[PDB]
Design an enzyme around this catalytic site. Structure first.
Site, PDB file in Angstrom:
ATOM      1  N   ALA A 125       0.827  -1.288   0.218  1.00 30.72           N
ATOM      2  CA  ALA A 125      -0.078   0.093   0.009  1.00 30.72           C
ATOM      3  C   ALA A 125       0.823   1.337   0.046  1.00 30.72           C
ATOM      4  CB  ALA A 125      -0.999  -0.128   1.189  1.00 30.72           C
ATOM      5  N   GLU A 171       8.158  -8.736  -0.729  1.00 30.62           N
ATOM      6  CA  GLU A 171       7.745  -9.400  -2.013  1.00 30.62           C
ATOM      7  C   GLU A 171       8.363  -8.794  -3.325  1.00 30.62           C
ATOM      8  OE1 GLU A 171       3.536  -9.629  -2.227  1.00 30.62           O
ATOM      9  OE2 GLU A 171       3.374 -11.712  -3.005  1.00 30.62           O
ATOM     10  N   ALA A 219       6.137 -11.084   4.086  1.00 30.60           N
ATOM     11  CA  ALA A 219       5.620 -11.528   5.412  1.00 30.60           C
ATOM     12  C   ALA A 219       4.324 -12.012   5.590  1.00 30.60           C
ATOM     13  CB  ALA A 219       5.540  -9.981   6.143  1.00 30.60           C
ATOM     14  N   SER A 259       1.063   0.888   5.610  1.00 36.86           N
ATOM     15  CA  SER A 259      -0.432   0.506   5.958  1.00 36.86           C
ATOM     16  C   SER A 259      -0.261  -0.449   7.098  1.00 36.86           C
ATOM     17  CB  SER A 259      -1.256  -0.130   4.904  1.00 36.86           C
ATOM     18  OG  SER A 259      -0.632  -1.588   4.620  1.00 36.86           O
ATOM     19  N   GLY A 315       3.653  -4.013   6.255  1.00 39.29           N
ATOM     20  CA  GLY A 315       3.413  -2.708   6.370  1.00 39.29           C
ATOM     21  C   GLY A 315       3.355  -2.355   7.956  1.00 39.29           C
ATOM     22  N   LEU A 341       8.710  21.723   7.571  1.00 40.84           N
ATOM     23  CA  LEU A 341       8.424  20.188   8.075  1.00 40.84           C
ATOM     24  C   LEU A 341       8.200  20.452   9.630  1.00 40.84           C
ATOM     25  CD1 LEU A 341       9.919  17.620   5.836  1.00 40.84           C
ATOM     26  CD2 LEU A 341       7.559  18.258   5.878  1.00 40.84           C
ATOM     27  N   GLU A 366       8.020  22.836  11.187  1.00 33.87           N
ATOM     28  CA  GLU A 366       7.271  23.993  11.801  1.00 33.87           C
ATOM     29  C   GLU A 366       5.882  23.625  12.356  1.00 33.87           C
ATOM     30  OE1 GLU A 366       7.893  27.399   9.466  1.00 33.87           O
ATOM     31  OE2 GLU A 366       5.972  28.524  10.367  1.00 33.87           O
TER      32      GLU A 366
HETATM   33  N1  LIG Z   1      -5.698   2.670  -0.801  1.00 33.25           N
HETATM   34  C1  LIG Z   1      -4.939   1.584  -0.974  1.00 33.25           C
HETATM   35  N2  LIG Z   1      -4.884   0.593  -0.062  1.00 33.25           N
HETATM   36  C2  LIG Z   1      -4.263  -0.501   0.032  1.00 33.25           C
HETATM   37  C3  LIG Z   1      -3.621  -0.848  -1.406  1.00 33.25           C
HETATM   38  N3  LIG Z   1      -3.070  -2.031  -1.311  1.00 33.25           N
HETATM   39  C4  LIG Z   1      -3.247  -2.431   0.128  1.00 33.25           C
HETATM   40  N4  LIG Z   1      -4.042  -1.534   0.680  1.00 33.25           N
HETATM   41  C5  LIG Z   1      -4.521  -1.789   1.972  1.00 33.25           C
HETATM   42  O1  LIG Z   1      -3.558  -2.596   2.647  1.00 33.25           O
HETATM   43  C6  LIG Z   1      -4.028  -3.639   3.488  1.00 33.25           C
HETATM   44  C7  LIG Z   1      -3.337  -4.773   3.859  1.00 33.25           C
HETATM   45  O2  LIG Z   1      -1.839  -4.552   4.200  1.00 33.25           O
HETATM   46  P1  LIG Z   1      -0.708  -4.592   2.995  1.00 33.25           P
HETATM   47  O3  LIG Z   1      -0.056  -3.355   3.137  1.00 33.25           O
HETATM   48  O4  LIG Z   1      -1.176  -4.410   1.518  1.00 33.25           O
HETATM   49  O5  LIG Z   1       0.106  -5.775   3.256  1.00 33.25           O
HETATM   50  P2  LIG Z   1       1.899  -5.839   3.099  1.00 33.25           P
HETATM   51  O6  LIG Z   1       2.449  -4.671   3.971  1.00 33.25           O
HETATM   52  O7  LIG Z   1       1.917  -5.509   1.683  1.00 33.25           O
HETATM   53  O8  LIG Z   1       2.235  -7.133   3.698  1.00 33.25           O
HETATM   54  P3  LIG Z   1       2.440  -8.100   2.668  1.00 33.25           P
HETATM   55  O9  LIG Z   1       1.324  -8.544   1.610  1.00 33.25           O
HETATM   56  O10 LIG Z   1       2.587  -9.573   3.371  1.00 33.25           O
HETATM   57  O11 LIG Z   1       3.627  -7.919   1.908  1.00 33.25           O
HETATM   58  C8  LIG Z   1      -5.602  -3.817   2.912  1.00 33.25           C
HETATM   59  O12 LIG Z   1      -6.393  -3.788   4.152  1.00 33.25           O
HETATM   60  C9  LIG Z   1      -5.860  -2.625   2.092  1.00 33.25           C
HETATM   61  O13 LIG Z   1      -6.662  -1.727   2.742  1.00 33.25           O
HETATM   62  C10 LIG Z   1      -3.624   0.182  -2.313  1.00 33.25           C
HETATM   63  O14 LIG Z   1      -3.101  -0.082  -3.379  1.00 33.25           O
HETATM   64  N5  LIG Z   1      -4.300   1.456  -2.155  1.00 33.25           N
HETATM   65 MG   LIG Z   2       2.769  -7.449  -0.741  1.00 36.94          MG
END
Ligand SMILES: Nc1nc2c(ncn2[C@@H]2O[C@H](COP(=O)(O)OP(=O)(O)OP(=O)(O)O)[C@@H](O)[C@H]2O)c(=O)[nH]1
Ligand SMILES: [Mg+2]
Ligand SMILES: Nc1nc2c(ncn2[C@@H]2O[C@H](COP(=O)(O)OP(=O)(O)OP(=O)(O)O)[C@@H](O)[C@H]2O)c(=O)[nH]1
Ligand SMILES: Nc1nc2c(ncn2[C@@H]2O[C@H](COP(=O)(O)OP(=O)(O)O)[C@@H](O)[C@H]2O)c(=O)[nH]1
Ligand SMILES: [Mg+2]
EC number: 3.6.5.-
Lengths: 426, 432, 50, 49, 432
Positions: free
Chosen positions: E12, E64, E92, E133, E139, E245, E247
């Protein structure tokens, strides 16, 4: 936005319903193949009401065909517009109901309706905002009335705050095409009173007599009778699909016609039926249609409105007319004819006008009326059932399939309750 | 600077509103695209985008899509804002307990948020122009909780409610007397001034003066649209003496209950007739107070007048008005209450009435619109309580209103207020 | 300016009404020809049966 | 791809295909005046000193 | 002399960076090839190679390989550094301990080597921009040990973080309540400003304003890409009142544990509606405070605001900003805390917004980006600990964590911190 689901049950329901899809596809511009070859941008504007989408610019109807004999729908599938339906929606059995109401409700129809509602469920959940249902049957047989009243009570519990449209052909006094016809009419109307919001009465005797004194037909086959019924079915629900100056949808007609929840049986009619002896000499004006509306020959049941009183009357016009001319014509029918209407309801008469007439006709309208004259149709059924019930004639296979003797007496008490309430409010 | 907001709810307001905005654009010289062809007269009703498009100050709200979707594809699709055309899914279908309790409660946040966005572009606000009819449940149930929120949110703003009244012989619905008594509850307390017009008197006027044999629903809205244009003509144009919306709110209404004036237009004439007749101020004033030209089917000669307000447009000299005013009080047929000698209010404007394309009205140099407040409504309300009591003695059509959420005691609560309103005329009609 | 605007709006309404009128008008002769074909079919069927 | 273009040209008549394509809004050229490039023009009120 | 470092981890965070570094190329005129045709406005984000290529300052790390390997094959192949694109072998797999304990240890020496190498090229560091995320295992797991190596290396540098909040109802993973708690055990210690965005609020932004009924992930990431380019715009362009930044750390972080603001952009509107509207300074600042435009699904009327930072762009002037801000303080709905009599911080820039070709956003003269620090997040964090407690009473999904190195005791230690952090919203919400 306002979708309707159509269900066809029985031989009488399927033959009328198969002509119904041929009438409205001409008004909307759909070929028998299912593609849209239409001429106006206004025909496709409101098309999701009766039709679901396909792949490749084709439109399929929102209909479910059900019957216990596969031979009936083989004629429908081989007809003119038989290639439009979904083959998944065809639900049939193998053993016929035998025109025995206890078969189509207890021992034969009770195994099919598990597969019938699953087609209904996935065709009604796919809508965005459903308005109601339509179902076509007759009150004389064991298939139209056995499974017909069972299908209502299963979906009334599933969808309580909706509206039911049943277009029922009532048994005639003098035609008498079935020996056990007074039995299954009383058994079926016991459920239509409690579970249906709008029920229409159609008589084969009246449909014959319209074809002779008005259309001057020589050979009125069963094709022409369904042409009269299907035009009235389209005129009721024209405010959903076409713009109008003073419009009225289905639930709009639910409130104005039904003062108390027991009286929802309507006698319908059609306005410009004309024979070609006097078609080319006819004058087309709003006062001219009004003469043809309140004719008791034009009504499609064997009840004389002058042997009763009117409760509520509506007429849904179609075409380009003047709305002052409509209402002073429909006020004059109430001021001068005061006895035939009730006294404790001012302005019995409702009106509605749409801007799209049927094809090939300049001006047209449909008639719907609620009268106390319909008690005689129910009284003649109740006295035919009373005579045979004393001797217990023809009754010993209904008792043979799990249906008690007290069930027939419960229907007769509820039937005589309906006759009393029409006379009480007269 | 000064402006007003227009709200069109139900169906009967929309075609009237469709006939009004086709009338407003020709007076201010705007094509129906919304851009002037290749002056602050339009600020009362329009907002100027910096690019050059004029946007009306109107919100078009209905519960069913079959009446508004003809405007999104019509000629005036380029004129409105796409978010101003609020649209529901299923119609209330002439059921007060639907359009107020279970269907009107899902789009009240959308309509009120457009009111805030239109009134935040405002600099100084004068009032509202709500168009509805009494008979339908959409024009009755939805208006009641619309103005309940506007009264709380906007304290002392005018709310000029334009309403269609149910005629005694011309009527469509059968549950129509049930809705109109229930409609009255929101107008006795949240409405500053509600104007009454029916359909049957317009039918005869088109049949007698215009010599139209077959009047329809597009011809009635042009007659109604002139009166709404005549009221607001003193805002967009300069005159000898100019009337604000708040100006004639005090002048017409005597009491906190009697706020139902009767609209009248003059001269309502055709093109083949006015080419021969000489029209001056001394004739068009007498034609207003004629018993055969009131646009509500009631007899004014039975009751007594309370207050009047005559608005003149076009080439009118105000000395000629005074001779017309003095002529009326000399006549014995026109009767006023003894506790009000000062019963007239005058307005002169320099902008003549305009013609519409395809219309039936004539090109006449001057025209006068009369707003009369009288006691002739007393028989018009003793009538409508008899229709309600006839159908309520046997409890007819009640089981539909009860099931949606409406109680049964409020039918009797609405009838006891109509008894209090009927006896308020006879209380003040007698001379001390 | 008022005359020019009235002229253009009259032309627009006239064109739309003409479209509606012609589309409604082209229906009836099809039904007339349909029943003429029906009458010919009935006569031919009677002669064939005899 | 050409046969899919045939299929989509036939399928473009649908209400769903008019209201909602993938990842976009509907066609705004009926809404806007004819001949105006949308991404080049500026929307709003210009402040002039 | 002013520079920022961006790190994109997970999927994300990275996929927004495809739409983020797309946007910076259009504003300064840099081609996707990396060569600039025929100025120090790009020194924050791009460092010019002497041959003529301009390379970004961003590091792309993902365990990945499948999401980075499409960047290495696309049009932007010639833009990034081949060594700033770091990939592993196996992800992960939605596991915290596969990003922090098991696999995240092996590749983090290559990650911090780059951040050490980028900082030596810069003459002044103003902060970090880490995009990830909460829900995923990469994330949530990988960013937790990245900052704790980062904080011991660079002490006083700001660490701005743009994290995707898990939505209340819609979610695409099952152990998100387990995996979002474990992020906040470190971000409340080693992070200074973490902005919040979810997916369900942008879905209704696209459905109502933009009139998009079928959105994808390229639609959302262009809206989030505008906010980051609006926050940073005071560093790349000249303005009337610029914000650094560092600030808006002092303006927005009153207590060490309350540093979770919500981003909001306006006017987010389509290209058909904006031609009808009169977008002014006095109205686009009201578009931020209505509850239908917050980019996190929470009701702000229940809570009270703490600190607001309104960042403007384009043709805006300081009179109309603060005349419209004082309009807000007279409104009873927007409720501030009494211990902050002042909470509004204003920044004004001179450059208008830039739209991407083929986008759905309209071309508007001005824009406003609002960063609101509010107390309404307690109800957003109340429902997520209720998700954790029901799943922990039966020890569901626990045995995947203990098989990698994570203990069971830290599930109790991380949960008790959310008992304190939600408590601190009430200890600051009570009035003195
Ligand atoms: N807005 C937005 N949200 C995303 C996107 N891709 C994933 N997400 C959010 O990310 C959440 C899942 O966590 P991720 O960050 O995708 O998982 P990750 O960190 O890649 O972990 P791995 O897949 O094991 O590598 C989902 O619930 C989505 O809401 C995107 O392209 N746009
Ligand atoms: Mg991934
Ligand atoms: N002047 C005028 N009156 C109209 C028009 N259409 C309907 N009416 C009147 O409105 C009355 C009923 O109210 P409507 O507005 O039509 O119905 P509604 O308020 O929309 O309620 P619903 O039909 O249930 O949605 C009728 O008695 C008509 O007399 C019109 O186009 N012009
Ligand atoms: N209008 C019309 N009525 C029909 C047709 N076919 C049968 N009927 C009527 O249906 C009645 C018998 O119904 P029945 O066949 O027992 O119903 P079922 O048990 O559902 O098949 C007869 O009295 C006929 O008048 C038809 O094609 N058109
Ligand atoms: Mg309506």
């Amino acid at each position: 936005m306002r979708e309707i689901v159509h269900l066809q049950a029985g031989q009488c329901g399927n033959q009328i319903g198969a002509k119904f899809w041929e009438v409205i596809s001409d008004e909307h511009g759909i070929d028998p193949t299912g593609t849209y070859h239409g001429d106006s941008d206004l025909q496709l504007e409101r098309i999701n009401v009766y039709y679901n989408e396909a792949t490749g610019g084709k439109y399929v109807p929102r209909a479910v065909l059900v019957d216990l004999e596969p031979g009936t729908m083989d004629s429908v599938r081989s007809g003119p517009f038989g290639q439009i339906f979904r083959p998944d929606n065809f639900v049939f059995g193998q053993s016929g109901a035998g025109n025995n109401w206890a078969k189509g409700h207890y021992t034969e129809g009770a195994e099919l309706v598990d597969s019938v509602l699953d087609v209904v469920r996935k065709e009604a959940e796919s809508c965005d905002c459903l308005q109601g249902f339509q179902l076509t049957h007759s009150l004389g047989g064991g298939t139209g009335s056995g499974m017909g009243t069972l299908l209502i009570s299963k979906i009334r519990e599933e969808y309580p705050d909706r509206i039911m449209n049943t277009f029922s052909v009532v048994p005639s006094p003098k035609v008498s095409d079935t020996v056990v016809e007074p039995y299954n009419a009383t058994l079926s109307v016991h459920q239509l009173v409690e579970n249906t919001d709008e029920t229409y009465c159609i008589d084969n005797e009246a449909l014959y007599d319209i074809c002779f004194r008005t259309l001057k037909l020589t050979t009125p086959t069963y094709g022409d009778l369904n042409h009269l019924v299907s035009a009235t079915m389209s005129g009721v629900t024209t405010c959903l699909r076409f713009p109008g100056q003073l419009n009225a949808d289905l639930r709009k007609l639910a409130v104005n016609m039904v003062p108390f929840p027991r009286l929802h049986f309507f006698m319908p009619g059609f306005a410009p039926l004309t024979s070609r002896g006097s078609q080319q000499y006819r004058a087309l004006t709003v006062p001219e249609l009004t003469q043809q509306m309140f004719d008791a020959k034009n009504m499609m049941a064997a009840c004389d409105p002058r042997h009763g009183r009117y409760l509520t009357v509506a007429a849904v016009f179609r075409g380009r007319m003047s709305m002052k001319e409509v209402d002073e014509q429909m006020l004059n029918v109430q001021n001068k004819n005061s006895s035939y209407f009730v006294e404790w309801i001012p302005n019995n008469v409702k009106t509605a006008v749409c801007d799209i007439p049927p094809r090939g006709l300049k001006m047209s309208a449909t008639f719907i009326g609620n009268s106390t004259a319909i008690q005689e149709l129910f009284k003649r059924i109740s006295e035919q059932f009373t005579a045979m019930f004393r001797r217990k004639a023809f009754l010993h296979w209904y008792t043979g399939e799990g249906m008690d003797e007290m069930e027939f007496t419960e229907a007769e008490s509820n039937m005589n309750d309906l006759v009393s309430e029409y006379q009480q409010y007269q | 600077m000064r402006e007003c907001i227009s709200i069109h709810v139900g169906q009967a307001g929309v075609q009237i509103g469709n006939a009004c905005w086709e009338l407003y654009c020709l007076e201010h010289g705007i094509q129906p695209d919304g851009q002037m062809p290749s002056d602050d007269s339009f600020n009362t009703f329009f907002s100027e985008t910096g690019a050059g498009k004029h946007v009306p100050r109107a919100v078009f709200v209905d519960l069913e899509p079959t009446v508004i979707d003809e405007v999104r594809t019509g000629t005036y699709r380029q004129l409105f804002h796409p978010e101003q055309l609020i649209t529901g899914k299923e119609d209330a279908a002439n059921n007060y307990a639907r359009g107020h309790y279970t269907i009107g409660k899902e789009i009240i946040d959308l309509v009120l948020d457009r009111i805030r966005k239109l009134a935040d572009q405002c600099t100084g606000l004068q009032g509202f122009l709500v168009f509805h009819s009494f008979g339908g449940g959409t024009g009755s149930g939805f208006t009641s909780l619309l103005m309940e929120r506007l009264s709380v949110d906007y304290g002392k703003k005018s709310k000029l409610e334009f309403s269609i009244y149910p005629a005694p012989q011309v009527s469509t619905a059968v549950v129509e007397p049930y809705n109109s008594i229930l409609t009255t509850h929101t107008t006795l307390e949240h409405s500053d001034c509600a104007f009454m017009v029916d359909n049957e008197a317009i039918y005869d006027i088109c049949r007698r003066n215009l010599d139209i044999e077959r009047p329809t629903y597009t011809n009635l809205n042009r007659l109604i649209g002139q009166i709404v244009s005549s009221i607001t003509a003193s805002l967009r144009f300069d005159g000898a003496l100019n009337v604000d919306l708040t100006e004639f709110q005090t002048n017409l209404v005597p009491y906190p209950r009697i706020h139902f004036p009767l609209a009248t237009y003059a001269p309502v004439i055709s093109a083949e007739k006015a080419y021969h007749e000489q029209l001056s101020v001394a004739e068009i004033t007498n034609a207003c107070f004629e018993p055969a030209n009131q646009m509500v089917k009631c007899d004014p000669r039975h009751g007594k007048y309370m207050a009047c307000c005559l608005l003149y447009r076009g080439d009118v000299v105000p000395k000629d008005v005074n001779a017309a005013i003095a002529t009326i009080k000399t006549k014995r047929t026109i009767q006023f209450v003894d506790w009000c000698p000062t019963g007239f209010k005058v307005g002169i404007n320099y902008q003549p009435p305009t013609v519409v394309p395809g219309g039936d009205l004539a090109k006449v140099q001057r025209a006068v619109c009369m707003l009369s407040n009288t006691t002739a409504i007393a028989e018009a309300w003793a009538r409508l309580d008899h229709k309600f009591d006839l159908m309520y003695a046997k409890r007819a059509f009640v089981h539909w209103y009860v099931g949606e959420g409406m109680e049964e005691g409020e039918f009797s609560e609405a009838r006891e207020d109509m008894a209090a309103l009927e006896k308020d005329y006879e209380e003040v009609g007698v001379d001390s | 300016l008022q005359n020019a605007l009235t002229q253009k709006l009259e032309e627009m309404l006239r064109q739309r009404e003409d479209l509606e009128q012609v589309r409604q008008e082209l229906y009836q002769e099809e039904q007339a020809e349909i029943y003429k074909s029906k009458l010919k079919e009935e006569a031919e069927k009677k002669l064939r049966k005899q | 791809t050409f046969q899919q273009k045939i299929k989509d040209k036939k399928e473009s008549i649908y209400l769903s295909n008019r209201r909602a394509p993938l990842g976009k809004s509907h066609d705004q050229a009926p809404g806007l005046p004819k001949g105006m490039d949308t991404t080049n023009t500026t929307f709003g009120t210009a402040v002039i000193k």
